[PDB]
Amino acid sequence: PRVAFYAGLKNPHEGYEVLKFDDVVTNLGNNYDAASGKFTCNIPGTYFFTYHVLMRGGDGTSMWADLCKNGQVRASAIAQDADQNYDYASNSVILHLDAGDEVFIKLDGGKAHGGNSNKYSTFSGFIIYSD
Amino acid sequence: PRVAFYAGLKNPHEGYEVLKFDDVVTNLGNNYDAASGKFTCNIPGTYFFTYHVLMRGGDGTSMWADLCKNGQVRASAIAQDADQNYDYASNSVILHLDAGDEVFIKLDGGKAHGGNSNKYSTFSGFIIYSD
Amino acid sequence: PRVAFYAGLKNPHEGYEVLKFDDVVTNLGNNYDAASGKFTCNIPGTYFFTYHVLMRGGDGTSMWADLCKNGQVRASAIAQDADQNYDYASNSVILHLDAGDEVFIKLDGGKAHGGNSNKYSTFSGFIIYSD
Ligand SMILES: [Cl-]
Ligand SMILES: [Cl-]
Ligand SMILES: [Mg+2]
Ligand SMILES: [Mg+2]
Ligand SMILES: [Mg+2]
Ligand code: NI
Ligand code: NI
Numbered sequence: 001p002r003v004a005f006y007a008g009l010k011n012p013h014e015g016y017e018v019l020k021f022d023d024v025v026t027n028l029g030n031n032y033d034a035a036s037g038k039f040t041c042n043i044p045g046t047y048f049f050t051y052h053v054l055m056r057g058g059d060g061t062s063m064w065a066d067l068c069k070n071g072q073v074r075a076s077a078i079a080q081d082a083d084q085n086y087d088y089a090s091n092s093v094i095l096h097l098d099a100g101d102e103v104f105i106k107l108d109g110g111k112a113h114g115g116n117s118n119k120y121s122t123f124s125g126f127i128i129y130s131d
Numbered sequence: 132p133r134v135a136f137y138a139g140l141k142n143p144h145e146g147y148e149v150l151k152f153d154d155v156v157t158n159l160g161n162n163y164d165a166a167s168g169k170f171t172c173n174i175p176g177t178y179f180f181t182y183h184v185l186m187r188g189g190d191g192t193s194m195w196a197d198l199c200k201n202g203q204v205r206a207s208a209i210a211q212d213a214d215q216n217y218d219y220a221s222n223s224v225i226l227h228l229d230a231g232d233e234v235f236i237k238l239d240g241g242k243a244h245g246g247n248s249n250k251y252s253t254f255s256g257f258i259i260y261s262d
Numbered sequence: 263p264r265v266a267f268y269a270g271l272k273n274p275h276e277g278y279e280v281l282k283f284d285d286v287v288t289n290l291g292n293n294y295d296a297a298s299g300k301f302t303c304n305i306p307g308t309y310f311f312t313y314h315v316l317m318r319g320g321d322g323t324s325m326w327a328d329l330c331k332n333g334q335v336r337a338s339a340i341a342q343d344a345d346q347n348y349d350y351a352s353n354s355v356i357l358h359l360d361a362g363d364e365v366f367i368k369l370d371g372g373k374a375h376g377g378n379s380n381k382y383s384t385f386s387g388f389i390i391y392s393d
Contacts, residue, residue: 002391004308006356008337025336026356028308028391046135046159048257050181050312050354057342061216074156075139076249080188082214083344085323090221090352092181094137094157094255118338124356126310126390128257129133129159177266177290179388181312192347205287206270207380211319213345221352223312225268225288225386259388260264260290 001043003029004126008119012056014111018104019053019065021123032123038104039125041097049103049125050092055079056111057086063110065089069103079110086113094128132174134160135257139250143187145242149235150184150196152254163254169235170256172228180234180256181223186210187242188217194241196220200234210241217244225259263305265291266388270381274318276373280366281315281327283385294385300366301387303359311365311387312354317341318373319348325372327351331365341372348375356390 005028007021020037032039041047055063061082067075077089097103105123113120136159138152151168163170172178186194192213198206208220228234236254244251267290269283282299294301303309317325323344329337339351359365367385375382 002308004310004356004390006354026308026358046133046157048135048255052339052353054340074250075253076246076251077183077219078185078217078251080216080218081212081343082216085342085344086340087218087342087349088339088352090219091183091250091253092137092255093250093253094135094257096157115338119336119353119355120338120340122337122353122355124310124354126356128135177264177288179266179386205381206384207377207382208314208350209316209348209382211347211349212343213347218349221350222314222381222384223268223386224381224384225266225388227288259266 001130003031003043005032006124007032009114009121010116012114013107016109017107019107023119038102041101042099043127043130044098045130046096046128047125048094048128051105051123052088052090054113054120055087056113058084060111063089064108066106066108067093068106069095070101132261134162134174136163137255138163140245140252141247143245144238147240148238150238154250169233172232173230174258174261175229176261177227177259178256179225179259182236182254183219183221185244185251186218187244189215191242194220195239197237197239198224199237200226201232263392265293265305267294268386269294271376271383272378274376275369278371279369281369285381300364303363304361305389305392306360307392308358308390309387310356310390313367313385314350314352316375316382317349318375320346322373325351326370328368328370329355330368331357332363
């Protein structure tokens, strides 16, 4: 089973919402959906995910981006700079997933930079083991 | 051989010490030990590790977190902000390990945020190849 | 096929150039070349890469580091701090590569810290799937 994806944000996002990474570069298995921003598991197993979300510079001082499995937070990150500089909220996880499980990044608050085609803000993952 | 782990810090750590990540989410192979903070290799091979350690905000300006293999530093990271903002010391490695080799993250100095169940500060790794 | 590498920067780099990571720790497959700073694919397939580039502290406020596939940017990152503190430009990708494809990190501008043997600034990658 080949499952591996990588997407850039493209569009700026601000405020509480799912980050819908819309510049999809790689998507083996077709399990990442840019319309919803969710990776949906169809092969149960253990997966690696990582994300790097760039806080917009020049306007705002804090930004929170968390990785979720279904309802639940499984990693948290903050970017913060009192001078309103660009900075990243990034983290990585390894999670076991059942078929139907959704994994996605949520913006808790603050402003994420959408870098158009530049892929400043990213979300990727792949299956390590199949059950 | 299935070896893959992911743990959050949970408890705040400050000053020189091994970071004992105590919120263990995934631990295929049972090779990560929260009591010691160490991953101990039992299957010789080549491994990926990554860590993301959040510096506490509101008190302190620098924090250093390094990945060690046995005695030796194999990656270094610093978080620094003169306004005492949250920021991350993060890095990633690929290392060959022999049976008995220990891999762990050490706090060299500064204050790491323990995010309780929020998994702000993290350590993960998995085997890529078995010898 | 075993392909997996990890290298530290070692030497300081400043201004537009390819980052030639010269402290090579792991290099299964011998596909990373410190002389050029490039990973060259010989086994077509899908690959994971990550990089963590530390901006020098005490002199300068911004630094840009991008991952390239051949001519083209496939991930971008910025480090920025108005007080001239250390900060990281980091990102991760998953890319399909054909034989002959080159992957490397370019410094677009600013000053990257070469940490000698300390491995503050790093580049790693491995093959997930072979075609
Ligand atoms: Cl793998
Ligand atoms: Cl100031
Ligand atoms: Mg949160
Ligand atoms: Mg150190
Ligand atoms: Mg650029
Ligand atoms: Ni910062
Ligand atoms: Ni700052």
